[PDB]
Amino acid sequence: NNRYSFIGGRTGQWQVVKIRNVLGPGLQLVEKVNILNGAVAEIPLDSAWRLQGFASNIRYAIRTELEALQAVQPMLNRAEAILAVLIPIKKSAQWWEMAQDERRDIFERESHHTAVGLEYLPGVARRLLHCRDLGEEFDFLTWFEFAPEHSSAFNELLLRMRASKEWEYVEREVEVWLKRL
Amino acid sequence: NNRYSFIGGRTGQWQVVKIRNVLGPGLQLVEKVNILNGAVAEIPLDSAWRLQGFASNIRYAIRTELEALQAVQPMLNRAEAILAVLIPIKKSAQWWEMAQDERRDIFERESHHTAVGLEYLPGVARRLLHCRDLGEEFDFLTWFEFAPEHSSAFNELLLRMRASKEWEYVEREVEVWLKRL
Ligand code: HEM
Ligand code: HEM
Numbered sequence: 013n014n015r016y017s018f019i020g021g022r023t024g025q026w027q028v029v030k031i032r033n034v035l036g037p038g039l040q041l042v043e044k045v046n047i048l049n050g051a052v053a054e055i056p057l058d059s060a061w062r063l064q065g066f067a068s069n070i071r072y073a074i075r076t077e078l079e080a081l082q083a084v085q086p087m088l089n090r091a092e093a094i095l096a097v098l099i100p101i102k103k104s105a106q107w108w109e110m111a112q113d114e115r116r117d118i119f120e121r122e123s124h125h126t127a128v129g130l131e132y133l134p135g136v137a138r139r140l141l142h143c144r145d146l147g148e149e150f151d152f153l154t155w156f157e158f159a160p161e162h163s164s165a166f167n168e169l170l171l172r173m174r175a176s177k178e179w180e181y182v183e184r185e186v187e188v189w190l191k192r193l
Numbered sequence: 194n195n196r197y198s199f200i201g202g203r204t205g206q207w208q209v210v211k212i213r214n215v216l217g218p219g220l221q222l223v224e225k226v227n228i229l230n231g232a233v234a235e236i237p238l239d240s241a242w243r244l245q246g247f248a249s250n251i252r253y254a255i256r257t258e259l260e261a262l263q264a265v266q267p268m269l270n271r272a273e274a275i276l277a278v279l280i281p282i283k284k285s286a287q288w289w290e291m292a293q294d295e296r297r298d299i300f301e302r303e304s305h306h307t308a309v310g311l312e313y314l315p316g317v318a319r320r321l322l323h324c325r326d327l328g329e330e331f332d333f334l335t336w337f338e339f340a341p342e343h344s345s346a347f348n349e350l351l352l353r354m355r356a357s358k359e360w361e362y363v364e365r366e367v368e369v370w371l372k373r374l
């Protein structure tokens with residue numbers, strides 16, 4: 013199954029450390045996040061919100077970039093990867109109206125998204141989920157997990173990405189910081 | 194709402210003329226196709242199959258190709274366009290494992306998908322829906338409609354695409370030919 017649900021509430025595998033409402037409407041503070049590898053028909057009782065998205069095919073990365081990523085990217089659920097962050101992201105209508113070459117040029121040629129991210133591997137494991145096509149309020153659910161040794165480096169990565177050309181088209185963004193239970 | 198369902202059965206806006214089971218498991222012959230905007234998980238008891246997909250963002254076309262398409266491509270629902278064809282399509286695992294540059298290279302540089310297609314506009318109107326990400330048995334639901342004057346031209350277009358490098362990666366394909374009621 014390629015579908016995942018993220019339920020903010022009183023159950024889950026991850027404890028919410030803090031929520032930072034970076035841009036646009038935030039998400040209600042909750043105790044934990046419950047991650048399920050399937051769709052949940054409705055938000056459970058007592059839970060505050062549900063996000064969902066699917067794993068999909070590559071949209072921008074070229075073969076040589078995939079080879080570099082696969083050489084170093086770490087697995088999920090490393091014993092030491094006790095910290096994580098869920099970052100839902102929505103991009104603007106202007107972005108989605110652009111053609112494929114226009115979006116690729118912004119994503120890598122101008123912002124060097126993959127090349128920059130590659131510097132912060134293998135410390136940081138990641139997972140990308142898509143959800144605009146499901147009608148969700150966000151466009152992407154991005155997931156990162158790492159050991160505390162890499163907290164400072166991950167903050168530096170965030171600083172670089174938020175300053176990029178790509179991020180000029182980001183319209184809504186929230187950070188849910190997590191600690192593994 | 195970007196989700197559409199196609200229910201093969203006894204009711205609907207379109208009458209089935211024939212079903213050509215081009216490649217792989219076919220679709221059971223039915224009387225009509227009913228098209229619904231949104232998702233359904235029931236389908237009337239007199240229905241043989243349901244298909245679903247969503248409209249999404251551009252994946253391969255570049256800006257100059259979009260400009261050429263927009264200059265000539267017709268709208269759906271032309272008074273004269275009383276014939277339609279629904280063509281569900283599934284591509285191989287090998288296709289989906291390829292990177293973005295590799296898939297684009299086959300799609301256009303080698304197969305000339307958009308350049309060939311442009312030759313049959315404005316006669317043929319089209320819609321493209323995606324459904325691999327929904328876990329469906331097909332990957333795409335493609336839709337075409339035209340006046341009878343263009344039936345032979347559309348048959349020619351099919352001939353040319355089925356012989357392309359791109360189509361070497363197609364592993365299931367069906368044609369549901371339809372007439373507007
Ligand atoms: C940590 C190292 C990172 C690496 C190696 C990395 C790599 C990538 C790659 C290769 C893609 C393209 C996938 C495709 O072609 O479909 C992608 C997509 C994306 N990533 Fe990252 N990334 C990293 C960090 C981040 C961070 C920190 C964020 C958010 C703050 C982020 C947000 C996104 C988004 C929103 C997309 C979707 C872009 C789109 O389809 O428009 N990534 N990432
Ligand atoms: C009639 C003229 C046609 C034109 C102008 C045309 C044009 C296009 C374009 C520009 C795309 C890329 C959309 C994107 O960038 O995401 C596309 C995708 C596609 N077309 Fe066509 N097309 C035509 C006919 C057909 C026919 C007759 C079929 C099937 C029998 C077909 C099957 C597909 C499929 C399956 C895709 C998705 C490709 C993929 O994502 O791998 N097209 N078409």
Ligand SMILES: [O-]
Nearest residue numbers: 138139140154
């Ligand atoms: O990512």
Ligand SMILES: [O-]
Nearest residue numbers: 319320321335
């Ligand atoms: O198409």
